[PDB]
Amino acid sequence: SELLVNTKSGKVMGTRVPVLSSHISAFLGIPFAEPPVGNMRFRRPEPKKPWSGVWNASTYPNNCQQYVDEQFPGFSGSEMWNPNREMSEDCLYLNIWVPSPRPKSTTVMVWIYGGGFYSGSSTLDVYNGKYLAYTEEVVLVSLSYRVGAFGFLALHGSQEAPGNVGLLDQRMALQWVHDNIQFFGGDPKTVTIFGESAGGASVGMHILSPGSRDLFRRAILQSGSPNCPWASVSVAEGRRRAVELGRNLNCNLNSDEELIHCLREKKPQELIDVEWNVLPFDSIFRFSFVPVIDGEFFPTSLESMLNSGNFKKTQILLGVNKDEGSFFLLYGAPGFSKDSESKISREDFMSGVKLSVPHANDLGLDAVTLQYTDWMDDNNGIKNRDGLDDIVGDHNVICPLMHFVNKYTKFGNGTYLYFFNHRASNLVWPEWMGVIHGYEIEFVFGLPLVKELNYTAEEEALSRRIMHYWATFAKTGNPNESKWPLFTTKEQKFIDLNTEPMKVHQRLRVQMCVFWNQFLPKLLNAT
Amino acid sequence: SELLVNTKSGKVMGTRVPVLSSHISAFLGIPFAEPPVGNMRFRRPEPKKPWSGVWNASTYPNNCQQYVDEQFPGFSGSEMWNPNREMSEDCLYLNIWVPSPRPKSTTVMVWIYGGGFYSGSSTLDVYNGKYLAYTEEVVLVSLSYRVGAFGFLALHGSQEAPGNVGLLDQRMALQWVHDNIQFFGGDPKTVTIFGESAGGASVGMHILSPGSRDLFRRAILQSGSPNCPWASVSVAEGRRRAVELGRNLNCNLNSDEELIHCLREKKPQELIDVEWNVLPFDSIFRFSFVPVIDGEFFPTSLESMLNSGNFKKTQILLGVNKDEGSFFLLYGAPGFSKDSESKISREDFMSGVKLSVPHANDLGLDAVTLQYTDWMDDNNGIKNRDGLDDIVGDHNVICPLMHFVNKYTKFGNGTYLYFFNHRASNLVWPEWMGVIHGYEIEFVFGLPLVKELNYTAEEEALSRRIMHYWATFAKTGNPNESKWPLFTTKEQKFIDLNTEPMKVHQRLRVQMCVFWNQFLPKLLNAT
Ligand SMILES: CC[N+](C)(C)c1cccc(O)c1
Ligand SMILES: CC[N+](C)(C)c1cccc(O)c1
């Protein structure tokens, strides 16, 4: 049967799922590793020991333990990212969508979810890969990885809590995908890994890490990149933060071993409850447990790896959303309210800039303000609001990203850059947040095709355009079959991704990113 | 007779000069001090000992020794500022234009010429006050002061070369004007001193210096202010520079006395020939001998005097020209040519920024470039040219000026601000220099009235508008009799001075001046 697949790990019994007016095969909850429960907590992922009999892949697996967003109870706009399944340390599973009839050797797409590394689930409705698989005839895989302390606690030097295990979970699923995707009709030599924000940053990290380059062909980075200010921390900082977490749970802090045994004995929720109290600054767009520059997964500093072309050379497709910042301001910046226009005063604005650049000194904060302030209307509430959004966005997502493309393109084999600036008609978030972080996902996953979701006609088109772009690029290394220009260091071409007839632009936010990528860094170094 | 005037200094025989289709009285070359020749060189100005018999004031006096501009031989646009008379250390004279019939007690206007303190003459044709006097029925006085080493050499602590003597020459003429203007029909209690660039900066210095406040009523500052980066130097710098000048002439440098005797024995031209070799940096818009913050003429630092309201409180009328920088770039910046479009490359642009901010460090130079560069078209020759012009202008004239108005208005009694941005139709300078430094003078002195000068009809109007504004403000402390708004710290209103129907704007170049007045200063201090 089309639902019974044999794999090097065991037999898998999938399920037939309905798509639009047809069907596809669905293999959900396939284990790719040993449950990271018990003294395995914080440990590197273990390979799933093969099984006997058919594994039932007809229902989504559990979700990884993680901070749940209770900020707006019942508000779909926020709950849609919350885990829709029971949480559990036993969460290392992957899901595959397979076209019906099963392909003999088609292109594979692996999705790596986002969540600032502290959250994420492969089972969210927005990550339902049935539409992409059906529409673009691609084998769509969605993996899961330990998030929060569970996946990134880093007691560097220890083997019980090495750090980056969440990064290893991803890799192992990539390995599982490499090793068994042929049995699902997928071509293991044409596997494209794509992700958003933390997933988008993860992708580039696999591009960078030597132990991961050989396991995938092409990559798609959405609103995230390896060098994002919040995507990593030094071994020391990770240590610092690991200890602090221990401190918060009344743990013996005399040795890694005492510390780690302690943390291993505390309930998942116990680590989560105090997870944000370890950050080093009052700040926004900063997450507690993230990848560490350990010298293992990452041979060295990301910048030198970038600088010396020490990374897998291939084709990459990446982009950013118009308003990357809003989301984070509405959640931790004063003056912002989900239900108000959020006109921001200068006192509040200047507070926002302090939360945005936590590492900046007074001069740095002053340089940022000078640059993002209209001194001819410095008391405008709208201009201050928007100014804050651009700051959170440029510094955390768009500028870090432009640095990575510019550096990548130098040695890479084809760069394609998009700028998503279309606000879904049915968006439930206040208008002032604009084209919000993570709201390109639904277009990439072809949600606009399901009419009972009420998208506009041109949004359906947009979704098919992006889905094709995404699927066609994965298949060939080029989004084109009206041509989306190749990104080059000289011309710096890039395009818009909206319901209007695509347009080609140059030098994405140069002014602001020169400041963020070259000037500020220098200033703060000098001072 | 209307030409014979008795004064507390002696009888003066003037001359009748023709204006438009009528006449006026002219008293030119009246001595206000003892010739600063001999061992008097560098010494403070001495009062003119009274004379017997009638003094012949029918021909302009000599001009003060000074660097002559030979950059464009025969080019009127530059020679028009050159001395049109024989130069001589015997140059402390003043000129008065008196309406015919002589007024009984009318408003007096004293003009203090510009020239970056190294040049200037009261006898230039552009400074011919017959038009203003006739048209506005005002007693127009034009003084002269020692310029260059002769007027500003500063061996602070010495009495032979105290420094600022050029500033004292001005004062003494002001005193002479105070003491004898009544005999010419001028009201000594309604004397307005106005000047351009160095004269405009001089004016504000007399506003500041305690020993000068009582000698005038109102002030008009054109394209210059006391705190201009080039208007003053510390006693040390002046000393440093005085010695260096001595070094250049093979002078005993063992004592002020040996040094000064040496300099006193060298010919005027000898000091001039080496006058520019003492500057401390490769730079533009920097002059060798300028006022020194000596603690005598200036009680203390200009900023604290500004900060504590330690200055004469009255009404002031000041402004700037659209393109203050061009002139200085065309003369010392690479890439600029009087006869070319002057499209500037980035290599040349970056050289310009180095010459513009000589005291800036690498970070400072980088902050300036970031701010004045269009990184979306950083290779534009026109944009680089213009960018350089704005830099030389904002930092040397417009921003220093905005700081002085903002500080002044705080304790002042009426501020009126103009922005001259009209390029005379008959301008002989290349179009790219735009509305050039010092080209408002001719409008203020009503040159556009003499048809054989070929101005347009609306330029004639402009000139009468400004002349009235200038004369009406001096008479009443208000330019208005369509109303030129009063400058206030809150609103920051100011107007345009061009052939088009005046318009009111706010916050003159805020963006750029916040950077220049607040950010940069801080940056360079921090680093
Ligand atoms: C904005 C919603 N989404 C789940 C994508 C999310 C949440 C936290 C951090 C992120 O970078 C992104
Ligand atoms: C630009 C011509 N003018 C004589 C007014 C002049 C010359 C030198 C320095 C100045 O600030 C102004």
mmCIF file of C-alpha atoms in Angstrom, chain B residues 98-270:
data_model
loop_
_atom_site.group_PDB
_atom_site.id
_atom_site.type_symbol
_atom_site.label_atom_id
_atom_site.label_comp_id
_atom_site.label_asym_id
_atom_site.label_seq_id
_atom_site.Cartn_x
_atom_site.Cartn_y
_atom_site.Cartn_z
ATOM 1 C CA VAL B 98 25.052 110.952 5.089
ATOM 2 C CA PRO B 99 21.678 111.628 3.482
ATOM 3 C CA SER B 100 21.197 115.011 1.807
ATOM 4 C CA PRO B 101 19.760 117.111 3.545
ATOM 5 C CA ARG B 102 21.682 115.942 6.608
ATOM 6 C CA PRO B 103 19.351 114.288 9.124
ATOM 7 C CA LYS B 104 19.044 115.797 12.609
ATOM 8 C CA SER B 105 19.075 112.490 14.474
ATOM 9 C CA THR B 106 18.615 109.383 12.319
ATOM 10 C CA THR B 107 19.482 105.710 12.769
ATOM 11 C CA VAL B 108 23.136 104.751 12.359
ATOM 12 C CA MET B 109 24.378 101.545 10.723
ATOM 13 C CA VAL B 110 28.011 100.452 11.176
ATOM 14 C CA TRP B 111 29.385 97.842 8.754
ATOM 15 C CA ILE B 112 32.148 95.432 9.793
ATOM 16 C CA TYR B 113 33.550 93.583 6.775
ATOM 17 C CA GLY B 114 34.412 89.904 6.563
ATOM 18 C CA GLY B 115 37.473 88.034 5.259
ATOM 19 C CA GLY B 116 38.136 85.150 7.677
ATOM 20 C CA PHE B 117 40.054 87.795 9.664
ATOM 21 C CA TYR B 118 42.992 87.627 7.237
ATOM 22 C CA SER B 119 41.499 90.037 4.691
ATOM 23 C CA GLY B 120 38.883 92.719 4.075
ATOM 24 C CA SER B 121 38.643 96.377 3.054
ATOM 25 C CA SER B 122 36.021 99.059 3.732
ATOM 26 C CA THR B 123 36.478 100.476 0.240
ATOM 27 C CA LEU B 124 35.273 97.552 -1.858
ATOM 28 C CA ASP B 125 32.587 98.494 -4.368
ATOM 29 C CA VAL B 126 30.192 95.956 -2.834
ATOM 30 C CA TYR B 127 30.512 97.825 0.468
ATOM 31 C CA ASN B 128 29.541 101.163 -1.101
ATOM 32 C CA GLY B 129 26.983 102.341 1.432
ATOM 33 C CA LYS B 130 25.617 105.188 -0.680
ATOM 34 C CA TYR B 131 22.602 103.156 -1.803
ATOM 35 C CA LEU B 132 21.531 102.098 1.680
ATOM 36 C CA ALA B 133 22.050 105.576 3.120
ATOM 37 C CA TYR B 134 20.128 107.273 0.332
ATOM 38 C CA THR B 135 17.324 104.710 0.019
ATOM 39 C CA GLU B 136 16.801 104.100 3.746
ATOM 40 C CA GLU B 137 17.816 107.551 4.998
ATOM 41 C CA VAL B 138 20.320 106.052 7.431
ATOM 42 C CA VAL B 139 23.768 107.251 8.462
ATOM 43 C CA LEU B 140 25.941 104.429 7.163
ATOM 44 C CA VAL B 141 29.367 103.966 8.689
ATOM 45 C CA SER B 142 31.904 101.400 7.494
ATOM 46 C CA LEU B 143 34.956 100.816 9.668
ATOM 47 C CA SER B 144 38.248 99.038 9.069
ATOM 48 C CA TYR B 145 40.390 96.894 11.342
ATOM 49 C CA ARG B 146 43.816 95.304 11.220
ATOM 50 C CA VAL B 147 43.583 91.817 9.767
ATOM 51 C CA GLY B 148 46.096 88.941 9.556
ATOM 52 C CA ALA B 149 49.081 88.818 11.925
ATOM 53 C CA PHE B 150 48.945 92.624 12.093
ATOM 54 C CA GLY B 151 45.586 92.543 13.841
ATOM 55 C CA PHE B 152 45.460 89.138 15.526
ATOM 56 C CA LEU B 153 48.989 87.940 16.343
ATOM 57 C CA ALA B 154 48.574 86.745 19.933
ATOM 58 C CA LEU B 155 51.442 86.524 22.419
ATOM 59 C CA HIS B 156 49.116 86.401 25.406
ATOM 60 C CA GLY B 157 50.689 87.833 28.540
ATOM 61 C CA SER B 158 52.740 90.277 26.494
ATOM 62 C CA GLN B 159 51.591 93.908 26.222
ATOM 63 C CA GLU B 160 53.295 94.466 22.874
ATOM 64 C CA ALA B 161 51.260 91.698 21.232
ATOM 65 C CA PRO B 162 48.243 91.043 23.446
ATOM 66 C CA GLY B 163 46.144 89.646 20.640
ATOM 67 C CA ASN B 164 42.658 90.728 19.586
ATOM 68 C CA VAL B 165 43.937 94.233 18.746
ATOM 69 C CA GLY B 166 41.937 93.886 15.498
ATOM 70 C CA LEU B 167 38.897 93.494 17.746
ATOM 71 C CA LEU B 168 39.938 96.654 19.608
ATOM 72 C CA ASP B 169 40.271 98.647 16.378
ATOM 73 C CA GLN B 170 36.622 97.882 15.718
ATOM 74 C CA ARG B 171 35.648 98.937 19.222
ATOM 75 C CA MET B 172 37.510 102.235 18.981
ATOM 76 C CA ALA B 173 35.688 103.062 15.746
ATOM 77 C CA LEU B 174 32.490 102.153 17.594
ATOM 78 C CA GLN B 175 33.606 104.547 20.333
ATOM 79 C CA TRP B 176 34.388 107.225 17.725
ATOM 80 C CA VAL B 177 30.947 106.612 16.230
ATOM 81 C CA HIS B 178 29.368 106.852 19.675
ATOM 82 C CA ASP B 179 31.197 110.090 20.408
ATOM 83 C CA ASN B 180 30.800 111.963 17.106
ATOM 84 C CA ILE B 181 27.905 110.497 15.060
ATOM 85 C CA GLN B 182 25.541 113.184 16.387
ATOM 86 C CA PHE B 183 27.460 115.787 14.373
ATOM 87 C CA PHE B 184 26.627 113.905 11.173
ATOM 88 C CA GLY B 185 22.947 113.701 12.066
ATOM 89 C CA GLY B 186 23.190 110.180 13.430
ATOM 90 C CA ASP B 187 21.662 109.097 16.732
ATOM 91 C CA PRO B 188 24.382 107.566 18.911
ATOM 92 C CA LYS B 189 21.712 105.689 20.867
ATOM 93 C CA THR B 190 20.381 103.824 17.826
ATOM 94 C CA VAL B 191 23.513 102.454 16.211
ATOM 95 C CA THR B 192 23.322 99.021 14.641
ATOM 96 C CA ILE B 193 26.503 97.111 13.864
ATOM 97 C CA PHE B 194 26.248 94.532 11.075
ATOM 98 C CA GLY B 195 28.854 92.373 9.353
ATOM 99 C CA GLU B 196 29.408 89.270 7.258
ATOM 100 C CA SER B 197 31.373 86.110 8.085
ATOM 101 C CA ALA B 198 34.342 87.482 10.084
ATOM 102 C CA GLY B 199 32.403 90.729 10.480
ATOM 103 C CA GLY B 200 29.288 88.756 11.380
ATOM 104 C CA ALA B 201 31.359 86.867 13.942
ATOM 105 C CA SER B 202 32.946 90.117 15.113
ATOM 106 C CA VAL B 203 29.488 91.577 15.773
ATOM 107 C CA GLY B 204 28.545 88.732 18.121
ATOM 108 C CA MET B 205 31.918 89.093 19.848
ATOM 109 C CA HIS B 206 31.082 92.744 20.635
ATOM 110 C CA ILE B 207 27.736 91.467 21.912
ATOM 111 C CA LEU B 208 29.715 89.131 24.155
ATOM 112 C CA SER B 209 32.645 91.289 25.270
ATOM 113 C CA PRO B 210 31.706 93.451 28.243
ATOM 114 C CA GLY B 211 33.848 96.366 27.036
ATOM 115 C CA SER B 212 31.781 96.658 23.837
ATOM 116 C CA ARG B 213 28.098 96.099 24.735
ATOM 117 C CA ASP B 214 27.421 99.707 25.728
ATOM 118 C CA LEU B 215 28.658 101.122 22.395
ATOM 119 C CA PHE B 216 25.866 99.901 20.074
ATOM 120 C CA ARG B 217 22.121 99.163 20.265
ATOM 121 C CA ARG B 218 21.197 96.312 17.925
ATOM 122 C CA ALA B 219 23.148 93.802 15.824
ATOM 123 C CA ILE B 220 22.908 92.057 12.454
ATOM 124 C CA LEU B 221 24.988 88.913 11.860
ATOM 125 C CA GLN B 222 25.385 87.633 8.298
ATOM 126 C CA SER B 223 26.800 84.171 7.725
ATOM 127 C CA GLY B 224 28.935 84.354 10.864
ATOM 128 C CA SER B 225 28.840 84.034 14.637
ATOM 129 C CA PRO B 226 31.248 84.198 17.577
ATOM 130 C CA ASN B 227 31.391 80.429 18.106
ATOM 131 C CA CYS B 228 32.263 79.605 14.507
ATOM 132 C CA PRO B 229 34.908 76.869 14.496
ATOM 133 C CA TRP B 230 37.301 79.235 12.733
ATOM 134 C CA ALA B 231 36.483 82.486 14.525
ATOM 135 C CA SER B 232 38.776 81.961 17.543
ATOM 136 C CA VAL B 233 41.686 80.030 19.088
ATOM 137 C CA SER B 234 43.039 79.448 22.606
ATOM 138 C CA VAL B 235 45.825 81.648 23.979
ATOM 139 C CA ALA B 236 48.099 78.632 23.621
ATOM 140 C CA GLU B 237 47.198 78.015 19.986
ATOM 141 C CA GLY B 238 47.660 81.727 19.244
ATOM 142 C CA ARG B 239 51.020 81.558 21.000
ATOM 143 C CA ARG B 240 51.912 78.368 19.181
ATOM 144 C CA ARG B 241 51.009 80.053 15.907
ATOM 145 C CA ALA B 242 52.767 83.313 16.797
ATOM 146 C CA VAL B 243 55.998 81.454 17.471
ATOM 147 C CA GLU B 244 55.700 79.388 14.291
ATOM 148 C CA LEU B 245 55.314 82.586 12.301
ATOM 149 C CA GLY B 246 58.502 83.804 13.988
ATOM 150 C CA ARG B 247 60.175 80.514 13.083
ATOM 151 C CA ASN B 248 59.250 81.083 9.452
ATOM 152 C CA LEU B 249 61.018 84.475 9.454
ATOM 153 C CA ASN B 250 64.186 83.364 11.253
ATOM 154 C CA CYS B 251 63.359 85.218 14.436
ATOM 155 C CA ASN B 252 65.044 84.977 17.809
ATOM 156 C CA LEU B 253 62.530 82.702 19.559
ATOM 157 C CA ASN B 254 64.028 82.962 23.045
ATOM 158 C CA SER B 255 61.520 85.534 24.329
ATOM 159 C CA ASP B 256 58.281 87.303 23.410
ATOM 160 C CA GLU B 257 60.356 90.495 23.263
ATOM 161 C CA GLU B 258 62.974 89.088 20.889
ATOM 162 C CA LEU B 259 60.220 87.449 18.861
ATOM 163 C CA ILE B 260 58.021 90.552 18.678
ATOM 164 C CA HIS B 261 60.938 92.925 17.949
ATOM 165 C CA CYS B 262 61.814 90.626 15.058
ATOM 166 C CA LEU B 263 58.290 90.569 13.656
ATOM 167 C CA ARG B 264 58.145 94.346 14.068
ATOM 168 C CA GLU B 265 61.242 94.747 11.907
ATOM 169 C CA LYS B 266 60.013 92.501 9.079
ATOM 170 C CA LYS B 267 58.088 94.066 6.197
ATOM 171 C CA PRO B 268 54.332 93.572 6.031
ATOM 172 C CA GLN B 269 54.559 91.375 2.940
ATOM 173 C CA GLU B 270 57.119 89.250 4.782
#
